Amino acid sequence: VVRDHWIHVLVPVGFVFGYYLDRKNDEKLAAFRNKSLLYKRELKPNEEVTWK
Amino acid sequence: PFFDVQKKLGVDLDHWMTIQSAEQPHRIPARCHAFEKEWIECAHGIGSIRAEK
Amino acid sequence: LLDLIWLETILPKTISLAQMKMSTTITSQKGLIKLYFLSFLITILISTTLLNFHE
Amino acid sequence: PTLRWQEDPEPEDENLYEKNPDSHGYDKDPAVDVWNMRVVFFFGFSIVLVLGSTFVAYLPDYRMQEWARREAERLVKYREAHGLPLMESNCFDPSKIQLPED
Amino acid sequence: MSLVYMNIMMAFTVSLTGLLMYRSHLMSSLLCLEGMMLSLFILATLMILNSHFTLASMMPIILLVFAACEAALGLSLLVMVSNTYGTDYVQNLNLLQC
Amino acid sequence: MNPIILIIILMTVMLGTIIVMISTHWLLIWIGFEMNMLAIIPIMMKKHNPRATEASTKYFLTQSTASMLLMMAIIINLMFSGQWTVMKLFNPMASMLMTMALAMKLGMAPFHFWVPEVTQGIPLSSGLILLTWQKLAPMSVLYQILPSINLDLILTLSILSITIGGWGGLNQTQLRKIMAYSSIAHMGWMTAVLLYNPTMTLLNLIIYIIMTSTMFTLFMANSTTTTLSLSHTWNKAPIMTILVLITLLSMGGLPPLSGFMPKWMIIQEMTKNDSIILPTLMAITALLNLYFYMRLTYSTALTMFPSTNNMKMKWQFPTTKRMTLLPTMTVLSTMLLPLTPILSILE
Amino acid sequence: ARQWQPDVEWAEQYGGAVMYPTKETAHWKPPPWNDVDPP
Amino acid sequence: AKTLLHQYWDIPEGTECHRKTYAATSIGGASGLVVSAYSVALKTPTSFLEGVARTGRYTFTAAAIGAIFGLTSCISAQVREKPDDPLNYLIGGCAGGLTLGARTRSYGIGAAACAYMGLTAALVKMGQLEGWKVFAEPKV
Amino acid sequence: RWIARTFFDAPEKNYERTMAILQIESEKAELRLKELEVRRLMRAKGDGPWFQYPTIDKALIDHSPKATPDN
Amino acid sequence: MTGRQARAPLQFLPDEARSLPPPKLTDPRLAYIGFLGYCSGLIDNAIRRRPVLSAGLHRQFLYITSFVFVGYYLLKRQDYMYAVRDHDMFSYIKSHPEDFPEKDKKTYREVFEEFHPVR
Amino acid sequence: MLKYIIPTMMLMPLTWLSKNSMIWINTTLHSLLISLTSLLLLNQFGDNSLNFSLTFFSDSLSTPLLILTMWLLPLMLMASQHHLSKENLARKKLFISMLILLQLFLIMTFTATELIFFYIMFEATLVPTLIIITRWGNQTERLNAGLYFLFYTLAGSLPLLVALIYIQNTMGSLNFLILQYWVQPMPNSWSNTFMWLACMMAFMVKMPLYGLHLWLPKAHVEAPIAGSMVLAAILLKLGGYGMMRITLLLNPITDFMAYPFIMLSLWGMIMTSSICLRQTDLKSLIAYSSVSHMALVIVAILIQTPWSYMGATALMIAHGLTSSMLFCLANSNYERVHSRTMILARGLQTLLPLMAAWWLLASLTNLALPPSINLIGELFVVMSTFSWSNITIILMGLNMVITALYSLYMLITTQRGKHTHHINNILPSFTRENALMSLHMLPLLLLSLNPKIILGPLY
Amino acid sequence: KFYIQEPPHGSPNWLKVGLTLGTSAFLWIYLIKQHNEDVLEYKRRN
């Protein structure tokens, strides 16, 4: 289905790439994970994360 | 730009015509030799503005 | 009256005519070298003695 | 004794009809005109306009409106049940202020 | 202040004005440029002589050999100008206009 | 005009510029300028028309009196504190004569009366080499003697150079006089920054040399002297049209295109002083010197002038020159906007 | 073909040695196309 | 030059009048002599008496612009009694532009010269008043 | 709720992003103003290692017994 | 701005630039340089009348390689220049406590301003 | 926001290596998919803005304008055939790629964090529009129009750069938050007055106001439909967006120094609504209509009320849609008859029975029909300016009367009463033109149902 | 076939294309080895 016509696959994969790289930037800018004075609970239940 | 292949190659092509108090061909002085020697040893490692002041 | 004729005279025309007249005064030079070196000489004199540059 | 030109007598007015009577908007290819009409009325209305209407018809409460409604209901109930006037002025406490003297 | 320096700088300005204002000739202009060369030569040489600055006595001879070959180039250009015309006026250069 | 002789003469132009750059002694600076003159005269008169002869005559007289004025300033420098070092001078009169000598050497507005005349009657290779090297080499010397210059000299010559190279320029249909007036405007733009941060001056020199090489390469690909020939080069080939479009709009200095990095960084490190009226005056004149670029573009690639035939005959024969380096210099001259932190390549 | 293009007289204005003729700039003849002056 | 513009800006403005008009005639005469020197160096009017005519014409027009500029500056400063606002030099530049148009005998050139000379004179007043270092810190 | 679950972001994520980003650019602005103040005082007095235009190198100054006794 | 320890040869990058971390591969600037090289190759096939997107793939690969190589070394030079600028700045901050005082962070309980209401 | 930047890049080589008679379908389909994905942005909530980097961030002012840009792209990319469908494949691809690149710089400009970046992408928006209108202007003064466009917009816009560099190196960085959270009042000196006049006058050039408005109508009557609609809608509303962002600084001196611009805008709004009542050249009426409504926008921005800013952004979005559509109907009538005039193409109620509905509905959205967004914007501007002064509502209502008059005269002139019975070439209305009209009108009515989107920061 | 006075290029040469591919592979291998030795030097020094 891909190599039949490969032109229509271009910009949705481009958008998926851009979305992936925005998530990568958000993981890069992950300072103040629980250092805000307002959004600060103790970490729970399992493993180390509250947003990613 | 002031390129310094002059200093990189280690060739003294332009450091003998330049100033007084260098090595003259016969080892002779200039007229105002010691004045430039004291002035240059005053303003050697100085950034050319407090060398003025 | 207001938009076309006066506003097109005040903003485009006066600027464009100033640029046209200054260009036709500057670039309209016949190629004689004596004029260019007399300009150099009076530039040197007007920089030395009238409007000082060594002071 | 002059013309100053050599080009074609121009133009011929392109009546886009009279070769495709079933034609949609643009030129005389039969298949791709149908594909253009189908893609603009499907992927411009049937998946864009109506799904956009459902998406921005309701979403999280934009610019915090219904949260503000419910929080104001709770706070007016509190401030009426506890004597003090609702919306006391001087939103910054005058204990926590220091005026320059005179 | 070594008074001879005053009249030699005066002679420099004289030769400079003779270079800059010039009428209907190019050989006289180049010859006044040669005089200006001589002025620079004499001025630098009196300085190097009175200062006993012996290792940089190359300035007068090298100044004059280089500006002499400048004068040779200028003479060849004047001969080319007089070859493509009859004369060598400042006039008849009026083509190639500004 | 043997190829050995041309290789020798171009090597001497290279050697003159290197001796200008590399020495710590004033005699080799004067010898470098002088050898650069003596070698750059027979790049002109590669033809034998009297145009090139009179152009080389005008260039020789102005260039030689600039060299003699330079030597006068150096001999005044040794009349005062006596050493042949390339540093801060010790007389405002000596720095005055020296900056006027270099101003005649690379063109300011009281001094620019040789530039369009000498670029008119020469071929394009000679104009390319004289613009690039003759405006490259004395910038090194000004970069070396910048801490001892009276400011009114540089700045009056720079303001006047920008406004005269702008105003003269709206009245020429020739190509070479347009490019010469553009050269005068860019000499002014480089000179006005020189007492504030000279990294901007050297980077503007790099950008202007790359732009001028692209411009003269796009005129070497198809022998044109007037804009009517530019419209016939619209008709013969389409890629020359869009590249004349992009390089003219990058000579103009428009922000997404890479001719804005020289102007705007100059605005930055000009206005981190308290000079504001001088940047807005210079940049309004930078608005002014874009109009002849824009009418050039309207002649080339936006409207279409009617072309003579025998282009019907020229279509069978493709443009089989070799370009010096056209595509690399084009994409480096026009697509180099987001690499502004290659400013700090230079210290 | 219904798009306007510049005519002969629109490009006649881009002639001569200068762009704006005045009372003093009429003698600026256009340069020879060979860059060769006749002897 | 610097010494005579310092003579112009030495006067309190304020009123110490006709010293101001004398200094403004000096400014106008110097500027007209500059323009006449270039315009006789680049044109050669053939002949020398016509060159004296062109120099005298340019110097007289520029000195008249300067003189009338200084007079109406003095009169506006005496009338309004406010040495602060640049509207007095606005009136000054417009009077200078109208007398320029009277000398060149064209009314539209006089109106445009009124406008631009008034704006530039007000800008020079505000530059001296608020304090705008033109051309130089030259430091950082 | 499904729209907020599958597409959007928590206010915690965006809020801490804003706070971290203000920390970053506050460092940038403070370093920029400190840069220009250091540059202006270093050009004014000259004590720093930036604006030092090269003076005479004294290694070529070679004191030795000359010809003339009074130098 | 000049030397800055004027022993200073021509010295495209010193040995001290091997202390700062080198620029990574597929950093976005060298990817932009690779795209600029690919556009250079496309337009080089367009200058001469050879067909675009074909017949020059060794020249495409040569252009991409040459630009990425040169841009890699220029990026290393950029990183060196910014590192030495910050090092000199903080050395001058530490070397002169007098001119750069601690500013009194007066909180907004006692900092007065004007108001000027827009009615 | 990078998820919106990068598929705009990727949609460009699509157009090149799609084959003949297939570039059209692929570009239209993929730009409509980009429009859906753009509509997925609308997340913005309450307290803060949303940050899509230290490089990109969106205020709620920028969200509907961004969706307007990515919605007006496919509408235009379909709108711009039948006057270049006979031209070459290479020139066609160049035109379509030029529109895509113009979209890219518009997204760059609307999600500009820094004002320096905003200025660079502002004049980057300025660049391709000259090339578009000059290469496909289809008239003989397109050179004059593009050149006036260029030098007006630069020579106004240029000392804005100097003022922005001065703010850059007197107060640190130019993120909108750290330009905010730090901004101090700037007193009534003269240098502050010139800085204000530089910034506000650059955007005054861009809107335009009355003394600088002949910039516009040549650039609309001597331009193709793509450059006309993008120019009007996105460039003028981008100028308004920029003034909205930069007016947060310079708080006290706008009361001292902002009276004559209010004045020139009001009296020129009246004179411009009067000049577009008697003209021929049907295209130009919508151009001077745009001048009148953006003078109203300028009055709304320079008075500084939250009611005024809500009404300003509503008026921006509604007038962008209405004026772009009405340009498109004018081009439809020009493709019917090669006239550009108004008294010639008469009739058209008898013939073309469906086009009357679109003319009437666009003229009523220009009339300020009361549930529409246009009257919402104009009404809040009238409320805020009557709070400003009790006397200026006469000019607002007189603008209202003359606006209804010329708009409905424009309706009943071209399309009311008698065909001139010597025309005999007009064909029945295509499906393409009516698809374009339905793509214009239906978002405006669906925003008229729920306008909590398009009201801006002060909701 | 099809060409009076057969074209000076188009018929592929075999020195220049191999020279360009060889120097390009050499330049890639050199920059990769330079980058890996620089990363190992950075981790040795820090």
mmCIF file with all atom_site columns, C-alpha atoms in Angstrom, chain J:
data_model
loop_
_atom_site.group_PDB
_atom_site.id
_atom_site.type_symbol
_atom_site.label_atom_id
_atom_site.label_alt_id
_atom_site.label_comp_id
_atom_site.label_asym_id
_atom_site.label_entity_id
_atom_site.label_seq_id
_atom_site.pdbx_PDB_ins_code
_atom_site.Cartn_x
_atom_site.Cartn_y
_atom_site.Cartn_z
_atom_site.occupancy
_atom_site.B_iso_or_equiv
_atom_site.pdbx_formal_charge
_atom_site.auth_seq_id
_atom_site.auth_comp_id
_atom_site.auth_asym_id
_atom_site.auth_atom_id
_atom_site.pdbx_PDB_model_num
ATOM 1   C CA . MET J 1 1   ? 37.802 42.462 20.857  1.00 0.00 ? 1   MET J CA 1
ATOM 2   C CA . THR J 1 2   ? 41.338 41.113 20.556  1.00 0.00 ? 2   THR J CA 1
ATOM 3   C CA . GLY J 1 3   ? 43.895 39.086 22.587  1.00 0.00 ? 3   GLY J CA 1
ATOM 4   C CA . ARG J 1 4   ? 43.322 37.800 25.456  1.00 0.00 ? 4   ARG J CA 1
ATOM 5   C CA . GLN J 1 5   ? 46.813 36.323 25.986  1.00 0.00 ? 5   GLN J CA 1
ATOM 6   C CA . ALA J 1 6   ? 48.518 37.387 22.780  1.00 0.00 ? 6   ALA J CA 1
ATOM 7   C CA . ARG J 1 7   ? 50.917 34.524 22.379  1.00 0.00 ? 7   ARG J CA 1
ATOM 8   C CA . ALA J 1 8   ? 48.033 33.527 20.137  1.00 0.00 ? 8   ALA J CA 1
ATOM 9   C CA . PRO J 1 9   ? 48.918 31.908 16.788  1.00 0.00 ? 9   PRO J CA 1
ATOM 10  C CA . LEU J 1 10  ? 46.480 31.675 13.865  1.00 0.00 ? 10  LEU J CA 1
ATOM 11  C CA . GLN J 1 11  ? 45.168 28.621 15.682  1.00 0.00 ? 11  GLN J CA 1
ATOM 12  C CA . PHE J 1 12  ? 41.743 27.617 14.360  1.00 0.00 ? 12  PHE J CA 1
ATOM 13  C CA . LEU J 1 13  ? 41.039 25.813 17.648  1.00 0.00 ? 13  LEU J CA 1
ATOM 14  C CA . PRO J 1 14  ? 43.345 25.456 20.676  1.00 0.00 ? 14  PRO J CA 1
ATOM 15  C CA . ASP J 1 15  ? 43.799 22.352 22.797  1.00 0.00 ? 15  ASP J CA 1
ATOM 16  C CA . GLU J 1 16  ? 41.654 24.025 25.483  1.00 0.00 ? 16  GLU J CA 1
ATOM 17  C CA . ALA J 1 17  ? 38.607 23.548 23.220  1.00 0.00 ? 17  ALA J CA 1
ATOM 18  C CA . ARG J 1 18  ? 38.888 19.797 23.862  1.00 0.00 ? 18  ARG J CA 1
ATOM 19  C CA . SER J 1 19  ? 37.724 20.426 27.447  1.00 0.00 ? 19  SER J CA 1
ATOM 20  C CA . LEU J 1 20  ? 34.272 21.673 26.526  1.00 0.00 ? 20  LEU J CA 1
ATOM 21  C CA . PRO J 1 21  ? 32.017 18.932 25.110  1.00 0.00 ? 21  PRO J CA 1
ATOM 22  C CA . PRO J 1 22  ? 32.090 18.653 21.313  1.00 0.00 ? 22  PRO J CA 1
ATOM 23  C CA . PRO J 1 23  ? 28.897 19.219 19.301  1.00 0.00 ? 23  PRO J CA 1
ATOM 24  C CA . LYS J 1 24  ? 26.811 16.089 18.918  1.00 0.00 ? 24  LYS J CA 1
ATOM 25  C CA . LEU J 1 25  ? 26.030 14.400 15.664  1.00 0.00 ? 25  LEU J CA 1
ATOM 26  C CA . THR J 1 26  ? 22.530 15.244 14.302  1.00 0.00 ? 26  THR J CA 1
ATOM 27  C CA . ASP J 1 27  ? 22.438 18.502 16.191  1.00 0.00 ? 27  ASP J CA 1
ATOM 28  C CA . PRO J 1 28  ? 19.889 20.639 14.290  1.00 0.00 ? 28  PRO J CA 1
ATOM 29  C CA . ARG J 1 29  ? 22.432 23.123 12.948  1.00 0.00 ? 29  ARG J CA 1
ATOM 30  C CA . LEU J 1 30  ? 24.477 20.517 11.098  1.00 0.00 ? 30  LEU J CA 1
ATOM 31  C CA . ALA J 1 31  ? 21.230 18.967 9.854   1.00 0.00 ? 31  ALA J CA 1
ATOM 32  C CA . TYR J 1 32  ? 20.325 22.404 8.493   1.00 0.00 ? 32  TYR J CA 1
ATOM 33  C CA . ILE J 1 33  ? 23.780 22.537 6.897   1.00 0.00 ? 33  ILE J CA 1
ATOM 34  C CA . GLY J 1 34  ? 23.112 19.145 5.310   1.00 0.00 ? 34  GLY J CA 1
ATOM 35  C CA . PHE J 1 35  ? 19.794 20.395 3.952   1.00 0.00 ? 35  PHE J CA 1
ATOM 36  C CA . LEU J 1 36  ? 21.543 23.488 2.619   1.00 0.00 ? 36  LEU J CA 1
ATOM 37  C CA . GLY J 1 37  ? 24.064 21.214 0.918   1.00 0.00 ? 37  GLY J CA 1
ATOM 38  C CA . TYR J 1 38  ? 21.297 19.153 -0.632  1.00 0.00 ? 38  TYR J CA 1
ATOM 39  C CA . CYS J 1 39  ? 19.627 22.319 -1.913  1.00 0.00 ? 39  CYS J CA 1
ATOM 40  C CA . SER J 1 40  ? 23.031 23.416 -3.242  1.00 0.00 ? 40  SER J CA 1
ATOM 41  C CA . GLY J 1 41  ? 23.334 20.148 -5.145  1.00 0.00 ? 41  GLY J CA 1
ATOM 42  C CA . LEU J 1 42  ? 19.790 20.445 -6.489  1.00 0.00 ? 42  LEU J CA 1
ATOM 43  C CA . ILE J 1 43  ? 20.433 23.965 -7.731  1.00 0.00 ? 43  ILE J CA 1
ATOM 44  C CA . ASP J 1 44  ? 23.828 22.913 -9.149  1.00 0.00 ? 44  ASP J CA 1
ATOM 45  C CA . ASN J 1 45  ? 22.006 20.331 -11.234 1.00 0.00 ? 45  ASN J CA 1
ATOM 46  C CA . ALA J 1 46  ? 19.677 23.201 -12.156 1.00 0.00 ? 46  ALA J CA 1
ATOM 47  C CA . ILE J 1 47  ? 22.382 25.683 -13.306 1.00 0.00 ? 47  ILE J CA 1
ATOM 48  C CA . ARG J 1 48  ? 23.567 23.516 -16.141 1.00 0.00 ? 48  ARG J CA 1
ATOM 49  C CA . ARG J 1 49  ? 20.672 21.933 -17.984 1.00 0.00 ? 49  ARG J CA 1
ATOM 50  C CA . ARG J 1 50  ? 21.214 18.437 -16.604 1.00 0.00 ? 50  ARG J CA 1
ATOM 51  C CA . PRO J 1 51  ? 18.030 16.989 -15.035 1.00 0.00 ? 51  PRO J CA 1
ATOM 52  C CA . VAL J 1 52  ? 17.270 17.792 -11.436 1.00 0.00 ? 52  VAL J CA 1
ATOM 53  C CA . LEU J 1 53  ? 16.961 15.007 -8.807  1.00 0.00 ? 53  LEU J CA 1
ATOM 54  C CA . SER J 1 54  ? 19.166 12.713 -10.936 1.00 0.00 ? 54  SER J CA 1
ATOM 55  C CA . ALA J 1 55  ? 22.500 12.355 -12.744 1.00 0.00 ? 55  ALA J CA 1
ATOM 56  C CA . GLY J 1 56  ? 24.593 13.961 -10.018 1.00 0.00 ? 56  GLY J CA 1
ATOM 57  C CA . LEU J 1 57  ? 24.358 11.729 -6.956  1.00 0.00 ? 57  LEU J CA 1
ATOM 58  C CA . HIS J 1 58  ? 28.103 11.640 -6.420  1.00 0.00 ? 58  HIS J CA 1
ATOM 59  C CA . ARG J 1 59  ? 28.049 15.448 -6.544  1.00 0.00 ? 59  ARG J CA 1
ATOM 60  C CA . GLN J 1 60  ? 25.071 15.471 -4.148  1.00 0.00 ? 60  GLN J CA 1
ATOM 61  C CA . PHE J 1 61  ? 26.969 13.277 -1.706  1.00 0.00 ? 61  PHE J CA 1
ATOM 62  C CA . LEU J 1 62  ? 30.155 15.344 -2.130  1.00 0.00 ? 62  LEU J CA 1
ATOM 63  C CA . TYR J 1 63  ? 28.303 18.603 -1.406  1.00 0.00 ? 63  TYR J CA 1
ATOM 64  C CA . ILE J 1 64  ? 26.585 17.181 1.687   1.00 0.00 ? 64  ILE J CA 1
ATOM 65  C CA . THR J 1 65  ? 29.880 15.774 2.993   1.00 0.00 ? 65  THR J CA 1
ATOM 66  C CA . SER J 1 66  ? 31.868 18.971 2.374   1.00 0.00 ? 66  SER J CA 1
ATOM 67  C CA . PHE J 1 67  ? 29.316 21.285 3.992   1.00 0.00 ? 67  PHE J CA 1
ATOM 68  C CA . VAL J 1 68  ? 28.743 19.025 7.013   1.00 0.00 ? 68  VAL J CA 1
ATOM 69  C CA . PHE J 1 69  ? 32.510 18.699 7.556   1.00 0.00 ? 69  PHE J CA 1
ATOM 70  C CA . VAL J 1 70  ? 33.216 22.437 7.348   1.00 0.00 ? 70  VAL J CA 1
ATOM 71  C CA . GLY J 1 71  ? 30.163 23.317 9.446   1.00 0.00 ? 71  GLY J CA 1
ATOM 72  C CA . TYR J 1 72  ? 31.249 20.799 12.083  1.00 0.00 ? 72  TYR J CA 1
ATOM 73  C CA . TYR J 1 73  ? 34.592 22.533 12.503  1.00 0.00 ? 73  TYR J CA 1
ATOM 74  C CA . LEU J 1 74  ? 32.978 25.986 12.514  1.00 0.00 ? 74  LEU J CA 1
ATOM 75  C CA . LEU J 1 75  ? 30.524 24.865 15.209  1.00 0.00 ? 75  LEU J CA 1
ATOM 76  C CA . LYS J 1 76  ? 33.420 23.653 17.343  1.00 0.00 ? 76  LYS J CA 1
ATOM 77  C CA . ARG J 1 77  ? 35.004 27.100 16.902  1.00 0.00 ? 77  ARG J CA 1
ATOM 78  C CA . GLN J 1 78  ? 31.709 28.782 17.911  1.00 0.00 ? 78  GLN J CA 1
ATOM 79  C CA . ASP J 1 79  ? 31.530 26.713 21.102  1.00 0.00 ? 79  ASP J CA 1
ATOM 80  C CA . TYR J 1 80  ? 35.141 27.585 21.947  1.00 0.00 ? 80  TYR J CA 1
ATOM 81  C CA . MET J 1 81  ? 34.544 31.304 21.459  1.00 0.00 ? 81  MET J CA 1
ATOM 82  C CA . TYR J 1 82  ? 31.454 31.395 23.671  1.00 0.00 ? 82  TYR J CA 1
ATOM 83  C CA . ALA J 1 83  ? 33.183 29.345 26.376  1.00 0.00 ? 83  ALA J CA 1
ATOM 84  C CA . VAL J 1 84  ? 36.174 31.680 26.521  1.00 0.00 ? 84  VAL J CA 1
ATOM 85  C CA . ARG J 1 85  ? 33.841 34.710 26.547  1.00 0.00 ? 85  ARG J CA 1
ATOM 86  C CA . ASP J 1 86  ? 31.971 33.387 29.591  1.00 0.00 ? 86  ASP J CA 1
ATOM 87  C CA . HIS J 1 87  ? 35.206 32.367 31.323  1.00 0.00 ? 87  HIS J CA 1
ATOM 88  C CA . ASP J 1 88  ? 36.690 35.859 30.910  1.00 0.00 ? 88  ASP J CA 1
ATOM 89  C CA . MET J 1 89  ? 33.430 37.481 32.044  1.00 0.00 ? 89  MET J CA 1
ATOM 90  C CA . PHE J 1 90  ? 33.191 35.475 35.257  1.00 0.00 ? 90  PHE J CA 1
ATOM 91  C CA . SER J 1 91  ? 36.896 35.983 35.954  1.00 0.00 ? 91  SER J CA 1
ATOM 92  C CA . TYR J 1 92  ? 36.328 39.735 35.768  1.00 0.00 ? 92  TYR J CA 1
ATOM 93  C CA . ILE J 1 93  ? 33.243 39.411 37.996  1.00 0.00 ? 93  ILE J CA 1
ATOM 94  C CA . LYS J 1 94  ? 35.291 37.575 40.614  1.00 0.00 ? 94  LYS J CA 1
ATOM 95  C CA . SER J 1 95  ? 38.315 39.861 40.316  1.00 0.00 ? 95  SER J CA 1
ATOM 96  C CA . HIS J 1 96  ? 36.500 43.129 41.203  1.00 0.00 ? 96  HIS J CA 1
ATOM 97  C CA . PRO J 1 97  ? 34.026 43.114 44.115  1.00 0.00 ? 97  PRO J CA 1
ATOM 98  C CA . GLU J 1 98  ? 33.842 46.918 44.349  1.00 0.00 ? 98  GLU J CA 1
ATOM 99  C CA . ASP J 1 99  ? 32.067 48.028 41.177  1.00 0.00 ? 99  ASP J CA 1
ATOM 100 C CA . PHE J 1 100 ? 29.402 45.266 41.227  1.00 0.00 ? 100 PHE J CA 1
ATOM 101 C CA . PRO J 1 101 ? 27.593 45.548 44.570  1.00 0.00 ? 101 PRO J CA 1
ATOM 102 C CA . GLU J 1 102 ? 24.812 43.479 46.076  1.00 0.00 ? 102 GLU J CA 1
ATOM 103 C CA . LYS J 1 103 ? 21.557 45.243 45.249  1.00 0.00 ? 103 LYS J CA 1
ATOM 104 C CA . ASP J 1 104 ? 19.044 45.551 48.086  1.00 0.00 ? 104 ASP J CA 1
ATOM 105 C CA . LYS J 1 105 ? 16.133 43.327 47.014  1.00 0.00 ? 105 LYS J CA 1
ATOM 106 C CA . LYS J 1 106 ? 13.404 45.500 48.482  1.00 0.00 ? 106 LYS J CA 1
ATOM 107 C CA . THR J 1 107 ? 10.188 43.512 48.264  1.00 0.00 ? 107 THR J CA 1
ATOM 108 C CA . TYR J 1 108 ? 6.945  45.028 47.001  1.00 0.00 ? 108 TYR J CA 1
ATOM 109 C CA . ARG J 1 109 ? 5.696  45.736 50.522  1.00 0.00 ? 109 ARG J CA 1
ATOM 110 C CA . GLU J 1 110 ? 7.780  48.932 50.487  1.00 0.00 ? 110 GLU J CA 1
ATOM 111 C CA . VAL J 1 111 ? 8.562  49.776 46.831  1.00 0.00 ? 111 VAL J CA 1
ATOM 112 C CA . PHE J 1 112 ? 6.466  52.737 45.701  1.00 0.00 ? 112 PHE J CA 1
ATOM 113 C CA . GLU J 1 113 ? 5.550  53.439 42.082  1.00 0.00 ? 113 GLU J CA 1
ATOM 114 C CA . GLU J 1 114 ? 3.290  55.818 40.231  1.00 0.00 ? 114 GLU J CA 1
ATOM 115 C CA . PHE J 1 115 ? -0.087 54.569 39.053  1.00 0.00 ? 115 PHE J CA 1
ATOM 116 C CA . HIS J 1 116 ? -1.557 56.715 36.180  1.00 0.00 ? 116 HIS J CA 1
ATOM 117 C CA . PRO J 1 117 ? -4.989 55.128 35.611  1.00 0.00 ? 117 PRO J CA 1
ATOM 118 C CA . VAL J 1 118 ? -6.358 54.698 32.110  1.00 0.00 ? 118 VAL J CA 1
ATOM 119 C CA . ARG J 1 119 ? -9.940 55.837 32.665  1.00 0.00 ? 119 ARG J CA 1
#
